[PDB]
Structures are given as C-alpha cells and as structure tokens.
Design a protein around this ligand. Structure first.
Ligand SMILES: O=C(CSCCNC(=O)c1cc(-c2ccc(F)cc2)cc(O)c1O)c1ccc(O)c(O)c1
Ligand SMILES: [Cl-]
Ligand SMILES: [Cl-]
Ligand SMILES: [Mg+2]
Length: 213
C-alpha cells in the first residue's frame, strides 16, 4: 500500500465516523508518530481556521487536496449551505480525499474534482455554475500558484474582497507568487509565520485579498 492508503486506514480505525475533529486528530497523530506527510498540519491549520472563521466564506476553491486534511479542516467550519470545491490532479489522491470526506461526514459540502486546475478553472462558471469565489486555498504544485492566480483573474472568478490563502510560501516556497502579490496594487497581503507540518522548520501562509483591477 501507499502512505496515503495507510493514512486513510488509520483514520478509519482511530477516528469516529462523522466527527471531523477526530479525523484531523487521527491524521496529525499518524503523521507525528508514524510517517510524515504533506498535510497542512495543526500549526498552520489553526491559522487557516482563524481565517475561515473571520470570513465565513460561502464558496471556497482549494487547489490541491492531497488526502483531504485541509478540505476537512475548512469544510467543518463552513456555515450550513456553504460549499467547497477542491481540484486534485492525482487520481489516487482524489480517491483518498473522497473517502476521507465521506468518513468525516462532509461529502455533501465538498465536491472533489479530479483534473488539472488550469483545465478546470475555465469551466467553473459554465459547468459548475460559479459566479465569483469568496476564498481560494492554494496548496498544489508551488510553481502553479502564480499562473493559476492570474488565470482566476482572467476568468472573472475573483471579486473585491476574495481571500487567497497560500500554503508553503517559505518551504518549499513560492517565490514568484509571493513577489507578485506583495508588489501588486490589486492585492492586500499579510504573512502568517508558522511551521512546516509536523516539523521544527519555519514555514508560513500568505493571505492576499483581491482588490479589483
Ligand atoms: O499535483 C500533484 C501534487 S500537488 C502536491 C503539492 N504540495 C507539495 O508539494 C507540498 C510539499 C511540501 C514539502 C515537501 C518536502 C519537503 F522537504 C518540505 C515540504 C509541503 C507541503 O505542505 C506541500 O503542500 C500531483 C499530480 C500528479 C501526480 O502524479 C502526483 O504525484 C502529484
Ligand atoms: Cl492538506
Ligand atoms: Cl503541525
Ligand atoms: Mg502544503
């Protein structure tokens, strides 16, 4: 089996069905005690939670699901009727994520789309009936943060006040994205220093609020 299969099995055997908090705790225990994995983790996860609670977004897009940790984290705090769309290009990861969300009881709030973000973003309006996004969580390949942000804008998916929240802006890092948003009058940026998941290594999140053209 793979590491992601191992993590899902551990959650299924160490968490309570329909209890998202127990799911998160199980994943964090596994990844601290058994094997590291690229989930956002509890340190950065607490900062994500604080942001979600501040903005109460009605429609969130996540780029990169992995095993579903961040999707569980966000979707458990959404208000009734609010929704998360997550784009996962790796089909094996998409399948893990779906099963993680099903176990957490969050499946009705989340739609996991298996494909490349650059292919799916242009379909969001016409195929998925999206108008504009309240929040975007970036956690996919780090060289894709900037091109996909510029694509979201092109496609008319950002509105005044759309919150972008980007993982891993220090490790592995996303230097083009970070320079861009920090230099642009169309974004208001805040850096949240933290730690790499499950490690004593500095990392951070960047929040960039879109201000229009
Ligand atoms: O699209 C994907 C993968 S997106 C994963 C991006 N995320 C990361 O890489 C990521 C990495 C690190 C990290 C790694 C090593 C370190 F030493 C330190 C940090 C941490 C994070 O929090 C991350 O989010 C895909 C498609 C098709 C495929 O066949 C496939 O295998 C994969
Ligand atoms: Cl994650
Ligand atoms: Cl952590
Ligand atoms: Mg990450």
């Amino acid at each position: 089996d793979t590491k992601e299969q191992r993590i899902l099995r551990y959650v299924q055997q160490n968490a309570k069905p329909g209890d998202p908090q127990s799911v998160l705790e199980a994943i964090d225990t596994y990844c601290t005690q058994k094997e590291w994995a690229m989930n956002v983790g509890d340190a950065k996860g607490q900062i994500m939670d604080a942001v979600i609670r501040e903005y109460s977004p009605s429609l969130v897009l996540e780029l990169g699901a992995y095993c579903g940790y961040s999707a569980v984290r966000m979707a458990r705090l959404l208000q009734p009727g609010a929704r998360l769309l997550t784009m996962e290009m790796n089909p094996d990861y998409a399948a893990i994520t779906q099963q993680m969300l099903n176990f957490a009881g969050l499946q009705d709030k989340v739609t996991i789309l298996n494909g490349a973000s650059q292919d799916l973003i242009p379909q969001l309006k016409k195929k998925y009936d999206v108008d504009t996004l309240d929040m975007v969580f970036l956690d996919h390949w780090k060289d894709r943060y900037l091109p996909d942000t510029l694509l979201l804008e092109k496609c008319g998916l950002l509105r005044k006040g759309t919150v972008l929240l980007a993982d891993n802006v220090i490790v592995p890092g996303t230097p083009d994205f970070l320079a861009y948003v920090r230099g642009s009058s169309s974004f208001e940026c805040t850096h949240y220093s933290s730690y790499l998941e499950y490690m004593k290594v500095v990392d951070g999140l960047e929040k960039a609020i879109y201000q229009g053209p």
